[PDB]
């Protein structure tokens, strides 16, 4: 499957920009350093002017002006902090076509092999010299289409890159922005003096030991099940889908990983502060407001208490994620002395450990630009074992599929174990 550039632009903002040197969090700088992948793929509609690239390029032009921050370039501080120049530079835009077909890609399972379909970023120039976001839209063989988005966490965490991107859609679906973006970041700043309360688990290094990437399609009726196994063992407290669903995954991973009785396991979750700081966020605030649960336990009684067990843990360490909580965490990073020497990695999910993020309440499927919803989004392509993400379906089955990355030999039995429901 070969696929070729034919057009390439940076695309800039359709009218001038305030230029502004717009200041990161902490939260802001502890960001995967490299772009955070998404794809959607879309069916051909039959329509001649399918994805036309003009009407396209317009409309991020015209996004742009809102959402200005994205045409710019990082550029680090008088005391040496990474900000923001909004200087309007642009968007990278490439138009690639494929001489494959869409369904090559099959289940969408994030292999990197879907890493062909984001446009791929040089480092090696400083952090002034590329794009804060990148975009590939590619074109196949019997008229499918796919996007690619690259964009930059320093710039905005994914509640915000989506609300970017549908904003797009909607410009280009000649309708007006309904949500304003609002642009200013030290509302977290950190308290003066900082003043933490708690250890603050989720930066500490994880517990220590003693590639394959597949996708897993749940039905509504097998969800439903699972959560009702929070009523065996004579247990009261009920919890939710997601937290069923997720402490099964992790019993699962767990399981199939083949861990010590005595094994210690620590699981990051990702979680929008949005919904619980006080005073709460402005609505269309634009930046990065995620911080981080981190559930511990026993390899062995994740193993051998009901499926209940984990789902507790798991809500346990998201109840404690309050405002109280949220502030601390913005002061803690405040006192640390190398903030990048502290982000996430290969290492930090490497086995015994794990994540789970879920996308079922962002939408993932609103980016219709004129031609119908996307058939699938996805993230871009899994990097290393340790990782999985829980996806709401496109379609009206109320499903959710779980796309998860481990090692050959755990996979088997992985798949085996998760519909041991």
């Not at 911080?291 to 360490?317: C, M, N, Q, R």
């Not at 965490?329 to 982000?343: C, G, N, R, S, T």
């Amino acid at each position: 499957m070969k696929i070729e550039v034919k057009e390439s632009t940076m695309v800039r903002p359709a009218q001038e920009t305030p230029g502004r040197n717009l200041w990161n969090s902490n939260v802001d700088l502890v960001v995967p350093n490299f772009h955070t992948p998404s794809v959607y793929f879309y069916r051909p509609t039959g329509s001649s002017n399918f994805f036309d690239a003009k009407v396209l390029k317009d409309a991020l032009s015209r996004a742009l002006v809102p959402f200005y921050p994205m045409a710019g370039r990082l550029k680090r501080d008088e005391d040496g902090r990474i900000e923001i120049e909004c200087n309007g530079e642009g968007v990278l835009f490439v138009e690639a076509e494929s001489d494959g077909v869409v369904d090559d890609f099959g289940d969408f399972a994030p292999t990197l092999e879907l890493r062909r379909l984001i446009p791929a970023v040089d480092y090696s120039q400083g952090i002034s010299s590329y794009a804060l976001l990148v975009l590939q839209v590619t074109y196949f063989k019997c008229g499918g289409v796919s996007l690619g988005v690259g964009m930059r966490h320093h710039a905005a965490d994914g509640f915000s890159g989506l609300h970017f991107i549908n904003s797009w859609s909607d410009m280009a679906r000649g309708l007006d922005v309904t949500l304003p973006p609002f642009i200013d970041r030290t509302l977290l700043r950190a308290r003066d003096p900082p003043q933490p309360q708690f250890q603050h688990i989720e930066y500490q290094p994880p517990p220590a030991l003693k590639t394959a990437v597949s996708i897993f399609k749940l039905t509504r009726e097998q969800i439903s099940a699972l959560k009702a196994k929070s009523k065996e063992d004579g247990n009261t407290i009920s919890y939710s889908s997601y937290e069923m669903l997720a402490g099964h995954v992790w019993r699962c991973a767990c399981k199939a990983r083949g861990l010590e009785v005595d094994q210690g396991t620590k699981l990051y979750i990702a979680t929008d502060g949005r919904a619980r700081l006080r005073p709460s966020l402005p609505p269309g605030y634009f930046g990065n407001v995620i911080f981080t649960a981190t559930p511990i336990a026993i390899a062995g009684d994740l193993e051998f208490k009901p499926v209940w067990y984990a789902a507790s843990k798991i809500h346990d360490a998201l109840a404690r994620m309050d405002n109280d909580y949220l502030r601390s965490a913005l002061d803690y990073l405040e006192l640390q002395p190398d903030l990048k020497a502290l982000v996430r990695g290969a290492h930090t999910f490497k086995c015994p450990n794990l994540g789970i993020t879920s996308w079922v309440r962002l939408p993932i499927h609103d980016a219709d630009f004129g031609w119908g919803r996307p058939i699938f989004m996805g993230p871009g392509g899994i990097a290393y074992e340790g990782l999985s993400f829980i996806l709401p379906s496109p379609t009206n089955d109320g499903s959710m599929s779980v796309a998860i990355s481990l090692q050959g030999e755990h996979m088997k039995l992985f798949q085996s174990f998760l519909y041991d429901i």
